[PDB]
């Protein structure tokens, strides 16, 4: 519908970056640019070195002319790896020719869109990620939508949510370039506190100011909502080591004491690589292509010493509560996993994270019996003898959980160990 205004559609088809909008803009790829052979077919760039990746898109002057000076929108999926809060300045997507045009860049924890009228004046809008929520860096995939009305407002959205909006000032003289260059270029004197990577996918430009309904419709149509995602936004897969973390306890890694799985405080935040890892194993599903999907039935394996256990319920040293059963690491055969350690997963994404929900499966079927949560309880594990100890553990609220159904403490994330 809004497709009518799509004037640039930068995509990877037949393994070649090209404008598929119909206006055959010219796409010249230079240096180290890696194209992904499988969805999302993203292309990877880097602040590499001499021959760093560089995608050049030269378009039609007439098209630009009859569009940019009124209203237009830019949308695309982007991922920057190791986007730390004290990151130095970088221009990533640029469309400025003679000190005029528009540019998109990053600095510290900001993604900023600048409308440059000349080398003396510009106006900009930006998004700044919550640092406290992304201490390990904002390294997830996210969708950007920048809508500009030269007679109205400049608005920026992140994953379909309006982030900021300012009234565009008089920038007469501003002259848009019919050229856009993708390349990570360091801006001198922006605090160089050290080599990052960036992936882009489906870079669009519309000759109209897209509104909410439109932005979000585009947003969704660009993804397979039934494919659960890992913490960074890539497709979640079976047979791969991941660090399983609960959304409410991001500073906790997985450990074990006896039959139970206990959660310990991680050392620091520059990483998520601490403690034991899990491997998701598929039991039932529609598609069989390695991607974890909506109603799939699965179990979790984990190698601890030189032995591998599976996650399942277990009787605690004492009852922890009504309809509450702990989840631990058990060396059990498959019949035992169907009864005590099988889960039906459901994707659960929010503006803040790519997470999932896990329901206790009944005999490895899609019949739910409870939800998976976390909490601290007092009982004994391993060689706990004389006293009872508080252990933050993965717990299942069995029959009645309509309330937890709404809690972030049932939101599970998976960071790839890689």
Q: What letter does residue 76 receive in the DSSP assignment?
A: E
Burial class (CB in 10 A: 0-12, 13-18, 19+), 143: buried
Range of the domain at 34: 1-230
H/E stretch holding 412 reads strand 412-416
Extract the tokens encoding 200. Answer: 């882009």
Phi, psi of 65 (to 5 degrees): -40, -60
CB 213 within 8 A of CB 221: no
Please list the alpha-helical segments (H only) found in 119-256. 212-221
Cis peptide before 40 (omega within 30 of 0): yes
The candidate with the shortest Cα–Cα distance to 218, out of 234, 230, 235, 205, is 205
Same domain, 271 and 368: yes
150 and 263 in a single domain? The answer is no
259 and 220 part of one domain: no
Report yes or no: 3 and 195 within 8 Å, Cβ to Cβ. no
Do 239 and 191 lie in one domain? The reply is no
Q: What SS3 class is residue 255?
A: strand
Question: What count of other Cβ atoms lies within 10 Å of the Cβ of residue 22?
Answer: 10
Q: 312 and 178 in one domain?
A: no
Q: What distances in angstroms separate CA 63 from CA 72, 173, 236, 285, 370, one per listed residue?
A: 12, 18, 40, 47, 56
Q: Are residues 189 and 259 in the same domain?
A: no
Looking at the structure of the chain, the number of domains it has is 2
Tell me: do 170 and 302 sit in the same domain: no
Same domain, 179 and 274: no
What tokens appear for 348 in the block? 């659960």
Instruction: For residue 307, give the CATH number of its domain.
Output: 2.80.10.50
* 95 Cβ neighbours under 8 A, 6+ residues apart: 101, 102, 103, 176, 177, 179, 180, 181
355/415 same-domain check: yes
The residue out of 230, 255, 277 marking a domain boundary is 230
DSSP label at residue 384: -
Q: How many Å apart are CA 114 and CA 222, to the nearest integer?
A: 26
Nearest to 146 by CA among 78, 234, 80, 232: 78
Dihedral sign of CA atoms 413, 348, 105, 131 in order: negative
Domain boundary among 195, 230, 265: 230
Pairing verdict, β 43-46 and 34-35: antiparallel
3-state secondary structure string across 191-225: CCCCCCEEEEEEEEEECCCCCHHHHHHHHHHCCCC
The reply to whether 264 and 413 lie within a common domain is: yes
Task: Tokens 């206790």: give the residue.
Answer: 360
* 275 and 216 share one domain: no
Domain boundary among 200, 230, 260: 230
CATH value at residue 190? 2.60.120.200
Q: To which residue do tokens 């995602």 refer? A: 229
Same domain, residue pair 253 and 348: yes
Instruction: Please indicate the experimental technique that yielded this structure.
Output: X-ray
């Amino acid at each position: 519908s809004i497709n009518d205004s799509k004037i640039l559609s930068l995509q990877n088809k037949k393994n070649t970056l090209m404008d598929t909008s119909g206006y055959n803009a010219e796409v010249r790829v230079e240096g180290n640019v890696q194209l992904n052979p499988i969805f999302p077919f993203d292309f990877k760039l880097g602040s590499s070195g001499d021959d760093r990746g560089k995608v050049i898109v030269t378009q039609n002057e007439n098209i630009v002319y009859n569009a940019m000076y009124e209203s237009f929108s830019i949308s695309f999926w982007i991922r920057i790896n190791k986007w730390v809060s004290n990151l130095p300045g970088y221009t990533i997507i640029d469309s400025v020719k003679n000190n005029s045009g528009w540019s998109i860049g990053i600095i510290s924890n900001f993604l900023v869109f600048t409308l440059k009228q000349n080398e003396n004046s510009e106006q900009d809008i930006n998004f700044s990620y919550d640092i406290s929520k992304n201490a390990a860096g904002y390294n997830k995939w996210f969708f950007v939508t920048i809508t500009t009305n030269m007679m109205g407002n400049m608005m920026i959205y992140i994953n379909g949510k309006l982030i900021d909006t300012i009234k565009v000032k008089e920038l007469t003289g501003i002259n848009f370039s019919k050229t856009i260059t993708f390349q990570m270029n360091k801006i001198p004197n922006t605090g160089l506190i050290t080599n990052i990577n960036m992936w882009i996918r489906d870079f669009y430009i519309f000759a109209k100011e897209l509104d909410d309904k439109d932005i979000n419709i585009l947003f969704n149509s660009l993804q397979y909502t039934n494919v659960v995602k890992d913490y960074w936004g890539n497709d979640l897969r079976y047979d791969k080591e991941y660090y399983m973390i609960n959304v409410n306890y991001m500073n906790r890694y997985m450990s074990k004491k006896g039959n139970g799985i206990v959660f310990n405080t991680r050392k620091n935040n520059n990483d998520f690589n601490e403690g034991y890892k899990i491997i998701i194993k598929r039991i039932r599903g529609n598609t069989n292509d390695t991607r974890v999907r909506g109603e799939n039935v699965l179990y979790f394996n984990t190698t601890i010493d030189n032995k591998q256990y599976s996650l399942g319920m277990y009787k605690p040293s004492r009852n922890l509560g009504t309809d509450l059963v702990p989840l631990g690491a058990l060396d059990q055969p498959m019949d035992e996993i169907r009864k005590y350690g099988s889960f039906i997963i459901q994707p659960c994404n929010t503006f803040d994270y790519y997470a999932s929900q896990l329901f206790l499966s009944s005999n490895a079927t899609t019949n739910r019996l409870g939800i998976l949560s976390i909490g601290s309880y007092s009982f004994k594990l391993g060689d706990d003898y004389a006293f009872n100890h508080e252990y933050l553990i993965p717990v299942i609220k069995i029959e009645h959980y309509a309330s937890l159904l709404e809690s972030t403490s049932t939101h599970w994330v998976f960071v790839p160990a890689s």
